[PDB]
Amino acid sequence: QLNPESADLRALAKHLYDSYIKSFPLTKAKARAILTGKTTDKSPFVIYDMNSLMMGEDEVAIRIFQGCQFRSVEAVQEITEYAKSIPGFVNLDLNDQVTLLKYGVHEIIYTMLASLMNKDGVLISEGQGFMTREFLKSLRKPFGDFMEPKFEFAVKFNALELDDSDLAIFIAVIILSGDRPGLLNVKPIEDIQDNLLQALELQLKLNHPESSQLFAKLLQKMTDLRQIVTEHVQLLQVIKKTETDMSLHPLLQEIYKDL
Amino acid sequence: ESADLRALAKHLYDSYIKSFPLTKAKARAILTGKSPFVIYDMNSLMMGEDKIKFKHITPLQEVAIRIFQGCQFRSVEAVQEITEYAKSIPGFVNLDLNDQVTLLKYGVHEIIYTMLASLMNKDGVLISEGQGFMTREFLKSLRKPFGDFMEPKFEFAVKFNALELDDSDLAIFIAVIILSGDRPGLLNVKPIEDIQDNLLQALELQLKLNHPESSQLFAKLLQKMTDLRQIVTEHVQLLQVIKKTETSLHPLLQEIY
Ligand SMILES: O=C(O)Cc1c[nH]c2ccc(O)cc12
Ligand SMILES: O=C(O)Cc1c[nH]c2ccc(O)cc12
């Protein structure tokens, strides 16, 4: 029914779930509680136009983009804190540690960003705001499409119906890759992930009995992430040329470099 | 064991062997221990056309261009082998005709590189039913954009072949790839996903029974699907950049491709 074996993997599930709660202020559970309206005090102020973008504080395209940019830098921070708590992660070559974060941080950001989205928009400013997909798609030329592929992924991905205890493990599997470019020590990294994969596989089986092969369906979604990430950097480089007065955060510049 | 899955597995394996001339097992014997004609440079390629007489892709009345053309001729040839295998997958044929076309259209490039891996090692790849072996370096030896056409694939193969899968495994892995419900333009996704789910259980059992030793191999293999997509898009980009050189006379040839 559950031997020494699984028992250890559950202990790992719990451990990761706990660090996740402790590292990310806005879990999917809270995100969805705000979005479904199962509240009165948790309801968000909606921004669907310039008019409301104004009241919402109580050119824009860039004021918004740069808003995402720094929020993004903040996520790299929360994720880096989460990584450290991944058994074995800190025991690796400090170089490989940086490499895993370099390539992993964004795929993780979009995985989690889905938790704040629904087909119509996304929660912002810690859930207090809600920016609609349409207002975002209406931004001037370039910026009008930087969020669209995120919604794309989010709708398909949210369909898997995963909760925080699931994501916590899935997000760890993402960091502990190994096929990541320039890793010095691949075996050590692969020994961790193999362990994380069993954790997720069991976690999903127990958490979603009625959902068969969800493990594989979740694993296949990683292709979507890479594509998303690539597309982002690409749209990112273009903007760099069009808007030369707009900066980019150093940290963020170090992640996209040689990426 | 759900004999139903152990069945779908043998079925798929049986079809894989009938649809594909050169198998992973066959190709691993050559690479290791009637040796193929080795093509390591320009002169060896020359004698190769008269020897290997792989002149099915060449008689068409520029070394880097005749090589690239040659790969495409094989690619087309493979597409038919894949299309035939596809029809062996339980239920594939019963799908909406358009969706069957859609699945094959977006899966062929992924399956080709997946199987191309079977024919290559870190130092080269097997060509023409395995009669040849074009070295990997003579391929970087190519100028223009032709010097990085295959390189991204040797890299993929090295990571992929490391999984040490065999034809019984690849047979199911490929079925899974074709049955991808995220192909743009599909009309009725449910059927395709149900079948893929079904194919996923078979590949899972296949790998646990065939590779008890390797932990989570199923999971690791699925991950390779990422590198595959990346390999394909990147490849499609090359075919774009290459579209700036030139283009029985061509008119009809350019059409077949
Ligand atoms: O990827 C980046 O560095 C910037 C970025 C663009 N759009 C986003 C939406 C949410 C988020 O957290 C960050 C971003
Ligand atoms: O629900 C998730 O997967 C986590 C998540 C996504 N976006 C966020 C922005 C801020 C924050 O504290 C947490 C999150």
UniProtKB/Swiss-Prot annotation, chain B:
A single GO cellular-component term from the record reads:
nucleoplasm
Induction cue = (Microbial infection) Expression increases when incubated with M.tuberculosis or its lipoprotein LpqH; induction is TLR2-dependent (at protein level).
Q: Where in the cell is it found?
A: Nucleus; Cytoplasm
Source organism? Homo sapiens
Gene Ontology terms for molecular function: alpha-actinin binding; arachidonate binding; chromatin binding; DNA binding; DNA binding domain binding; DNA-binding transcription activator activity, RNA polymerase II-specific; DNA-binding transcription factor activity; DNA-binding transcription factor activity, RNA polymerase II-specific
Swiss-Prot/TrEMBL keywords = Activator, Biological rhythms, Cytoplasm, Diabetes mellitus, Disease variant, DNA-binding, Glycoprotein, Isopeptide bond, Metal-binding, Nucleus, Obesity, Phosphoprotein, Receptor, Transcription, Transcription regulation, Ubl conjugation, Zinc, Zinc-finger
User: Which residues are involved in binding rosiglitazone?
Assistant: Q72, F73, R74, S75, H109, H235, Y257
> Where does the source fall among the domains of life?
Eukaryota
Q: Does the keyword Cytoplasm apply?
A: yes
Q: How does it assemble?
A: Interacts with FOXO1 (acetylated form). Heterodimer with other nuclear receptors, such as RXRA. The heterodimer with the retinoic acid receptor RXRA is called adipocyte-specific transcription factor ARF6. Interacts with NCOA6 coactivator, leading to a strong increase in transcription of target genes. Interacts with coactivator PPARBP, leading to a mild increase in transcription of target genes. Interacts with NOCA7 in a ligand-inducible manner. Interacts with NCOA1 and NCOA2 LXXLL motifs. Interacts with ASXL1, ASXL2, DNTTIP2, FAM120B, MAP2K1/MEK1, NR0B2, PDPK1, PRDM16, PRMT2 and TGFB1I1.
Supply the name of the protein. Peroxisome proliferator-activated receptor gamma
Its predominant location is: nucleus
Its PTM note reads: Phosphorylated in basal conditions and dephosphorylated when treated with the ligand. May be dephosphorylated by PPP5C. Ubiquitinated by E3 ubiquitin-protein ligase complex containing FBXO9; leading to proteasomal degradation. Ubiquitinated at Lys-18 by TRIM55 leading to proteasomal degradation. Ubiquitinated by E3 ubiquitin-protein ligase STUB1/CHIP; leading to proteasomal degradation.
Q: Which residues of the full protein are shown?
A: 235 to 501 of 505
Chain ranges of the NR LBD domain = 4-257
* Implicated disorder: Defects in PPARG can lead to type 2 insulin-resistant diabetes and hyptertension. PPARG mutations may be associated with colon cancer.
Q: What are its GO biological-process terms?
A: BMP signaling pathway; cell differentiation; cell fate commitment; cell maturation; cellular response to hypoxia; cellular response to insulin stimulus; cellular response to low-density lipoprotein particle stimulus; epithelial cell differentiation
Which body tissues produce this protein?
Answer: Highest expression in adipose tissue. Lower in skeletal muscle, spleen, heart and liver. Also detectable in placenta, lung and ovary.
Report residues of the Glycyl lysine isopeptide (Lys-Gly) (interchain with G-Cter in ubiquitin) crosslink.
K18
Q: What is known of its domains?
A: The 9aaTAD motif is a transactivation domain present in a large number of yeast and animal transcription factors.
Q: What does this protein do?
A: Nuclear receptor that binds peroxisome proliferators such as hypolipidemic drugs and fatty acids. Once activated by a ligand, the nuclear receptor binds to DNA specific PPAR response elements (PPRE) and modulates the transcription of its target genes, such as acyl-CoA oxidase. It therefore controls the peroxisomal beta-oxidation pathway of fatty acids. Key regulator of adipocyte differentiation and glucose homeostasis. ARF6 acts as a key regulator of the tissue-specific adipocyte P2 (aP2) enhancer. (Microbial infection) Upon treatment with M.tuberculosis or its lipoprotein LpqH, phosphorylation of MAPK p38 and IL-6 production are modulated, probably via this protein.
Q: Which family does it belong to?
A: Belongs to the nuclear hormone receptor family. NR1 subfamily.
Q: Where is this motif: 9aaTAD?
A: 251-257
Q: How is the activity of this protein regulated?
A: PDPK1 activates its transcriptional activity independently of its kinase activity.
